[PDB]
Design a protein around this ligand. Structure first.
Ligand SMILES: Cn1c(=O)c2c(nc(N3CCNCC3)n2Cc2nnc(-c3ccc(Cl)c(Cl)c3)o2)n(C)c1=O
Ligand SMILES: Cn1c(=O)c2c(nc(N3CCNCC3)n2Cc2nnc(-c3ccc(Cl)c(Cl)c3)o2)n(C)c1=O
Lengths: 195, 193
């Protein structure tokens, strides 16, 4: 049984905080850790959601819908699962379908919803729900989606075949320099590893 | 189309720092962002590595070797891929094999090495390698390893063909959380069947 002993504020910004965390190990020694925390969430099951969108069309391979967007901390573009903070009072499933439509224009159905999972455990306390969402690419709504992005949001949609995800990801990075998100790569990696 | 303009320090810690980032959007408008950066080092292909350890035995289905460890920012224990910063001058492959060994006691072989991938693009510039490592669980060495040292890491081996449900089982406990990359991997294992 290891414990949080105390949490010291080091600096507060609007969106994110830097804290000094004092905890103690099974030996009984007090140690410290520099933790990052979002000031964004309070009461909820998690900060946000990540959406795994599976574009399903008859007589076709399933596509995985990914987004491409500039990330200021990375100082460059990244390939990611559609994601965003859960609003106040919203279910993970609802935030998932909302975010997906906002960024890609696709309207999907909930397939499954994960427990809250750590985004960056060794550095921060951000948790998310990973929501798998199927998209009927044959239904009339999804024939041609329309993104409804916010002010600061410029999002490009990228669909890659599920049956060949890992190599298509490597292909994109060959054509230009962008960085695949770790959750996306892990997903792609397991697809080839399975069986 | 979007570019970094300037990045000014807001507070610097011993390992990790907080910066404010100024950039320009495609329209030409100037915006800002609060970025987290490790002060630890820039020489590498990436900040660290995550190891996907595949326990291979002739009489069993492959296990995935995971670790359970207390994470102060989470204020609780987390189930993760063996991971750690890459030392300086060390290859991703070497750090992977080193880290896997330190945490689990297993000695493995490199299967494949990924490109640098972002840990948390909307918050930080941390990049890592996902290095796939096979473990000969039939070999005498690995009969049952002992994890080499300063911290406290519990080893958990779970069947690959049944990873996700075994993960959901463990995580229902009080402060035990599955890492997002671990869960994404497990999700894909199940979607693929
Ligand atoms: C911010 N910070 C540290 O980053 C730190 C730390 N204490 C330590 N260590 C841990 C290793 N032994 C010496 C002590 N470290 C290094 C470390 N531990 N875990 C990772 C890791 C895990 C996953 C990934 Cl993907 C990456 Cl890139 C890094 O980094 N303290 C006290 C701290 O505030
Ligand atoms: C630290 N920080 C922000 O977190 C921030 C931010 N500006 C904003 N917004 C963007 C949305 N519209 C209004 C402004 N946000 C909110 C936000 N943007 N992206 C996520 C997100 C992405 C992925 C995941 Cl997995 C999660 Cl859990 C969260 O959160 N600025 C300037 C900032 O420094």
């Amino acid at each position: 049984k290891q414990y949080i002993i105390s949490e010291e504020l080091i600096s507060e910004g609007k969106w994110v905080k830097l804290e000094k965390t004092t905890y103690m190990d099974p030996t009984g020694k007090t140690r410290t850790w520099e933790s990052v925390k979002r000031t964004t969430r309070k009461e909820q099951t998690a900060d946000g959601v990540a959406v795994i969108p599976v574009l399903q069309r008859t007589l076709h391979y399933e596509c995985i819908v990914l987004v491409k967007q500039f990330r200021p901390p990375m100082g460059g573009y990244c390939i990611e699962f559609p994601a965003g903070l859960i609003d106040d009072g919203e279910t993970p499933e609802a935030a998932a379908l909302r975010e997906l439509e906002e960024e890609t224009g696709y309207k999907g159905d909930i397939a499954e919803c994960s427990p809250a999972v750590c985004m960056d455990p060794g550095l921060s306390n951000c948790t998310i729900h990973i929501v798998t969402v199927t998209i009927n690419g044959d239904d009339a709504e999804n024939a041609r989606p329309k993104p409804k992005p916010g002010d600061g949001e410029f999002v490009e949609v990228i669909s890659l075949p599920k049956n060949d995800l890992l190599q298509r990801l490597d292909a994109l990075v060959a054509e230009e320099h962008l960085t695949v998100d770790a959750r996306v790569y892990s997903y792609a990696l397991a697809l080839k590893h399975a069986n």
